[PDB]
PDB file of C-alpha atoms and ligand atoms in Angstrom:
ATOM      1  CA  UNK A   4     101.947 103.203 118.587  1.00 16.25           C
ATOM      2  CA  UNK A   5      99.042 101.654 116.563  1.00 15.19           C
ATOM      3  CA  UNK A   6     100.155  99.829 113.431  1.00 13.50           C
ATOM      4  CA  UNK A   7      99.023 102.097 111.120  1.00 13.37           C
ATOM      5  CA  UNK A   8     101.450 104.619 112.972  1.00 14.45           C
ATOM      6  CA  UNK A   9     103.804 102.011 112.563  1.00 12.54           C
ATOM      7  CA  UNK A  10     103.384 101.670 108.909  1.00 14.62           C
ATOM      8  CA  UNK A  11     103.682 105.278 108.223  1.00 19.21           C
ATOM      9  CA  UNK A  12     106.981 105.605 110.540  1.00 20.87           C
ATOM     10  CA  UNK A  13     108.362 102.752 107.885  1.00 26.69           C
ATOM     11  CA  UNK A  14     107.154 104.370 105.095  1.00 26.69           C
ATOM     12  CA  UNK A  15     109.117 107.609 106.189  1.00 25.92           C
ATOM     13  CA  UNK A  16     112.178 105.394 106.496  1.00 23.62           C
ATOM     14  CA  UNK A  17     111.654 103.826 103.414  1.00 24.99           C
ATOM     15  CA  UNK A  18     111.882 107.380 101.548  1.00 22.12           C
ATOM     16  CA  UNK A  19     114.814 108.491 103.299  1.00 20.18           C
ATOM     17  CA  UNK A  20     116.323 105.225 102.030  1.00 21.48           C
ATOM     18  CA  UNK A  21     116.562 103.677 105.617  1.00 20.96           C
ATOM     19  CA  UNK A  22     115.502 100.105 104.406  1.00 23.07           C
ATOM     20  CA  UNK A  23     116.421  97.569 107.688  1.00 24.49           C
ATOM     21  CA  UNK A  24     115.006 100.469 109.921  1.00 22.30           C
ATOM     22  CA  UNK A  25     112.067 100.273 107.491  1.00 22.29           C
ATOM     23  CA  UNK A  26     111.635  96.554 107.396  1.00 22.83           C
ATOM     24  CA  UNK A  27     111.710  96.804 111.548  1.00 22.59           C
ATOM     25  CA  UNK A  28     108.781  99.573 111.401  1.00 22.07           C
ATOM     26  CA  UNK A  29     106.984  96.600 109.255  1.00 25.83           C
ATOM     27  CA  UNK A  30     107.323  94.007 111.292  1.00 24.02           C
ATOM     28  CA  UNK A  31     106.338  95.799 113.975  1.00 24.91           C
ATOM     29  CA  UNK A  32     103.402  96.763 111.968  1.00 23.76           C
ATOM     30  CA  UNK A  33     102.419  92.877 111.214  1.00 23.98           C
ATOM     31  CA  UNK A  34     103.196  92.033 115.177  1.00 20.32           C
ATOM     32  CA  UNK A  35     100.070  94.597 116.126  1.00 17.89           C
ATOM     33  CA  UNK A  36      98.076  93.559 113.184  1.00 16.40           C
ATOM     34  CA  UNK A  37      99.024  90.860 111.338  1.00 14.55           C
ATOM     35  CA  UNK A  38      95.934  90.587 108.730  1.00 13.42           C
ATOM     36  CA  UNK A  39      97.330  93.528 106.957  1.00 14.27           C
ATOM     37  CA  UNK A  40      99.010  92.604 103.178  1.00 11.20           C
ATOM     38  CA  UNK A  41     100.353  96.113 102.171  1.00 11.58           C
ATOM     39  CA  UNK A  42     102.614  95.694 105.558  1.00  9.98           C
ATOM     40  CA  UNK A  43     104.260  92.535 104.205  1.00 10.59           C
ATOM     41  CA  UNK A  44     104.281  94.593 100.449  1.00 10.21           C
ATOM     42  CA  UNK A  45     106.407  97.524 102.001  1.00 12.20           C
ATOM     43  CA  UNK A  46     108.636  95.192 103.854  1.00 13.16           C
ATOM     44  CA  UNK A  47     109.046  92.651 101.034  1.00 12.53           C
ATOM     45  CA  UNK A  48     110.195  95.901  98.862  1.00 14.75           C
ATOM     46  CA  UNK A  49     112.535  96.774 101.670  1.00 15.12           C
ATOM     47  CA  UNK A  50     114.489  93.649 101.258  1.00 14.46           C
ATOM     48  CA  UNK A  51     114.131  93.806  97.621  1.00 14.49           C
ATOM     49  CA  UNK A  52     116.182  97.101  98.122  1.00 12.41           C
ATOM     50  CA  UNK A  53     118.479  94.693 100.412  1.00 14.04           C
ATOM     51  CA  UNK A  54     119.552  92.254  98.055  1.00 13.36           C
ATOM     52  CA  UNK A  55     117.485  89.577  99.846  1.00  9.75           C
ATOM     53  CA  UNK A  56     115.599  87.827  97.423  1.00 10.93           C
ATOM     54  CA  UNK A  57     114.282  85.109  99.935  1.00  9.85           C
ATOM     55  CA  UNK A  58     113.495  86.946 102.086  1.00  7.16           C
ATOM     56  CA  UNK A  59     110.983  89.112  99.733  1.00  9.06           C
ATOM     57  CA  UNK A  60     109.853  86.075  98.464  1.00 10.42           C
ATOM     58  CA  UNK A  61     108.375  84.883 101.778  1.00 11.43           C
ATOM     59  CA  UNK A  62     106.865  88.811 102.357  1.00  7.03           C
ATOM     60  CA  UNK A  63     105.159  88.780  98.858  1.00  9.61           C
ATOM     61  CA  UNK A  64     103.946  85.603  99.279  1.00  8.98           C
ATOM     62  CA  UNK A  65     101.966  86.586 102.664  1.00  8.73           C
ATOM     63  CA  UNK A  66     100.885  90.090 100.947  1.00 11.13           C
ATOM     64  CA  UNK A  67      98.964  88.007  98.103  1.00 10.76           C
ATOM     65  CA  UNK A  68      97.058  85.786 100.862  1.00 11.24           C
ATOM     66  CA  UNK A  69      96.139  88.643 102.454  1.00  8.57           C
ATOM     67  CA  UNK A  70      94.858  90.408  99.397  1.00  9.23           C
ATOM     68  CA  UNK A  71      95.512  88.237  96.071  1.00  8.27           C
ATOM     69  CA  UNK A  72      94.160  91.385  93.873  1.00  7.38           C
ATOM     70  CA  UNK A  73      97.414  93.383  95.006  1.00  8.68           C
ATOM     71  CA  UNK A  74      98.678  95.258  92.384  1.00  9.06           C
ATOM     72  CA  UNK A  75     102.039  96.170  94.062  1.00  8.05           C
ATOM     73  CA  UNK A  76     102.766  92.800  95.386  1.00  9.13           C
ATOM     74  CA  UNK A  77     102.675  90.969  92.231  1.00 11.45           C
ATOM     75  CA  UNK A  78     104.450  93.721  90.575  1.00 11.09           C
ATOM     76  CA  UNK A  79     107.404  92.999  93.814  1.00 14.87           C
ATOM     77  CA  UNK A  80     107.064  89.464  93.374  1.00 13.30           C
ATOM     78  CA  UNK A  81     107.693  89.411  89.857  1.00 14.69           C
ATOM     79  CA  UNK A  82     110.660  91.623  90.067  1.00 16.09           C
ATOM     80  CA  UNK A  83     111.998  89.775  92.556  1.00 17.06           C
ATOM     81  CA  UNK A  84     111.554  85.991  91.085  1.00 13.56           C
ATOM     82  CA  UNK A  85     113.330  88.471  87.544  1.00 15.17           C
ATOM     83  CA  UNK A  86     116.826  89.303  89.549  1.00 14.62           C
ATOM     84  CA  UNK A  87     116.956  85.520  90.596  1.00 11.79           C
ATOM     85  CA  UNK A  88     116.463  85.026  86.807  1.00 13.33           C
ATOM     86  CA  UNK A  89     112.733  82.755  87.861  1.00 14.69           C
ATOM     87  CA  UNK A  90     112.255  84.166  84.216  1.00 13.09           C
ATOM     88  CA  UNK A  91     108.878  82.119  83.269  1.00 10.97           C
ATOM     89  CA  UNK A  92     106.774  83.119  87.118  1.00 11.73           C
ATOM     90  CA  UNK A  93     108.345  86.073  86.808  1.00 10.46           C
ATOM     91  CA  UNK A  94     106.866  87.021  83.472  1.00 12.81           C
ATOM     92  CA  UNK A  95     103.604  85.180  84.850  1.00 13.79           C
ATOM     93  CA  UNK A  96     103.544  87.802  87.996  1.00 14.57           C
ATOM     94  CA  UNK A  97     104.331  90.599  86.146  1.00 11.25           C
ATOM     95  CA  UNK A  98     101.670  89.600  83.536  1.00 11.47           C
ATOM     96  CA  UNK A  99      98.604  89.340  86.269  1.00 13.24           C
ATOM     97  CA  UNK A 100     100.287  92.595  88.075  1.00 13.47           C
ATOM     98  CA  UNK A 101      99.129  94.454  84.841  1.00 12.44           C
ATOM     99  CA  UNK A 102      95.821  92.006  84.700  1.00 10.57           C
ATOM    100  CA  UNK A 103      94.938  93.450  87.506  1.00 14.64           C
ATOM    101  CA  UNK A 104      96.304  97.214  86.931  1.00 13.47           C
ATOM    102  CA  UNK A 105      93.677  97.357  84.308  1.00 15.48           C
ATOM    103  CA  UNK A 106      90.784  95.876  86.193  1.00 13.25           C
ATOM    104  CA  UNK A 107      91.718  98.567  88.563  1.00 15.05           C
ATOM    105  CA  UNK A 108      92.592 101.353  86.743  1.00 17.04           C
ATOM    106  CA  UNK A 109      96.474 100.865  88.239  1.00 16.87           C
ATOM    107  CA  UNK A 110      97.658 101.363  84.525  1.00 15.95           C
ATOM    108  CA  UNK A 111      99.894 104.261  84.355  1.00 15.41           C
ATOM    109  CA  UNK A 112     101.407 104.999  80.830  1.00 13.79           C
ATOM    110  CA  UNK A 113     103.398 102.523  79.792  1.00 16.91           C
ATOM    111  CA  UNK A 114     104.790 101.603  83.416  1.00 17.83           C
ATOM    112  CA  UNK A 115     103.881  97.998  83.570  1.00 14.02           C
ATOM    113  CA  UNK A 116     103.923  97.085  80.300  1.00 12.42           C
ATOM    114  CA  UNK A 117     107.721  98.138  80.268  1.00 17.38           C
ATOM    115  CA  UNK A 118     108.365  95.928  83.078  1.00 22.45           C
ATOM    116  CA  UNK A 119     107.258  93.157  80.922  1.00 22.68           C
ATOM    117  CA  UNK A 120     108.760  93.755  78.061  1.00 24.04           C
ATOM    118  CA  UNK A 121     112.159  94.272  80.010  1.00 25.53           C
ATOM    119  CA  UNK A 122     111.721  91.008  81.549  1.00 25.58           C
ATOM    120  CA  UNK A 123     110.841  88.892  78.492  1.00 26.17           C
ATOM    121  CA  UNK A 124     113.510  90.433  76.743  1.00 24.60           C
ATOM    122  CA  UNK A 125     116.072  89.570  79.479  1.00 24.67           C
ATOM    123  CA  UNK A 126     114.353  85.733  79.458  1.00 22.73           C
ATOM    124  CA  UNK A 127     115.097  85.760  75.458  1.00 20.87           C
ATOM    125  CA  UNK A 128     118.599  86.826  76.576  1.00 20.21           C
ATOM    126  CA  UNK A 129     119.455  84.195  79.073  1.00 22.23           C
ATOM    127  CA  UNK A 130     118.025  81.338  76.743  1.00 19.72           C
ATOM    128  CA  UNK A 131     120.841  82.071  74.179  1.00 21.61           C
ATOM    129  CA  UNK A 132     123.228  81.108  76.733  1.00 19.77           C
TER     130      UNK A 132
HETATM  131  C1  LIG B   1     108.724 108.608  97.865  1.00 18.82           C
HETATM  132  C2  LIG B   1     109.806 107.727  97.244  1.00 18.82           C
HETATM  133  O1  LIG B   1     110.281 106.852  97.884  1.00 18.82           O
HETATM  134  N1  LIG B   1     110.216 107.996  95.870  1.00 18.82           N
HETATM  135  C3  LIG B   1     111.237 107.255  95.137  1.00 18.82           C
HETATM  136  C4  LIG B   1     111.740 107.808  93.970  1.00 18.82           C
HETATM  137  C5  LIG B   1     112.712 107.142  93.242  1.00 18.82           C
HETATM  138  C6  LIG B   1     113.192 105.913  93.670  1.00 18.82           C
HETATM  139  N2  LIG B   1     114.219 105.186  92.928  1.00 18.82           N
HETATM  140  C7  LIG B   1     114.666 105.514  91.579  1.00 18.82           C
HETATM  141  O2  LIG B   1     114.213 106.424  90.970  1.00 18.82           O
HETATM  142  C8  LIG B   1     115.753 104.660  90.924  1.00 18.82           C
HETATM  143  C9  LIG B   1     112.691 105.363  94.839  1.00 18.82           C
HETATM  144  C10 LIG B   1     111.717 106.027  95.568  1.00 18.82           C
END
């Protein structure tokens, strides 16, 4: 199987919920052709699903090398640095997620901009305590 086969067979994983049979479909995916950043996106999701932040750090950090005008990864990268309450690069990722939306016409109703909002209210939240 090619690696885009290999990225669609994780992708119909991912829908049916199947998240470490996903994230094995991915890394298969990166083995055949590792110069691809939406396979490290879909994986890095995949163990944002998992409750493994680390680990989705390290996958949306190689997504942005290989493409540092991804959407997606930011947006993944941003929710993931928000559940480990990184509240400030969080906001920052998020932020250049929707920079970026724009310049590409990603901008879907108020989708991004809610993300935002959500996270800068939960950073107000945590500096009361
Ligand atoms: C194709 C696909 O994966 N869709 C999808 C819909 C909803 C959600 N999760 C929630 O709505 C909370 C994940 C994936």
């Amino acid at each position: 199987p090619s690696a885009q086969e290999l990225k669609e067979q994780g992708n119909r994983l991912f829908v049916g919920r199947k998240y470490p049979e996903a994230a094995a479909c991915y890394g298969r995916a990166i083995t055949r052709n590792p110069l691809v950043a939406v396979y490290y996106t879909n994986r890095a999701l995949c163990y944002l699903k998992m409750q493994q932040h680390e680990q989705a750090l390290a996958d949306c950090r190689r997504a942005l090398e290989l493409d540092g005008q991804s959407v997606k990864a930011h947006f993944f990268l941003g929710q993931c640095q928000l559940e480990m309450e990184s509240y400030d690069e969080a906001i920052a990722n998020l932020q250049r997620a929707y920079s970026l939306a724009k310049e590409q016409r990603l901008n879907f109703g108020d989708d991004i901009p809610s993300a935002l909002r959500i996270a800068k209210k939960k950073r107000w939240n945590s500096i009361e305590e």
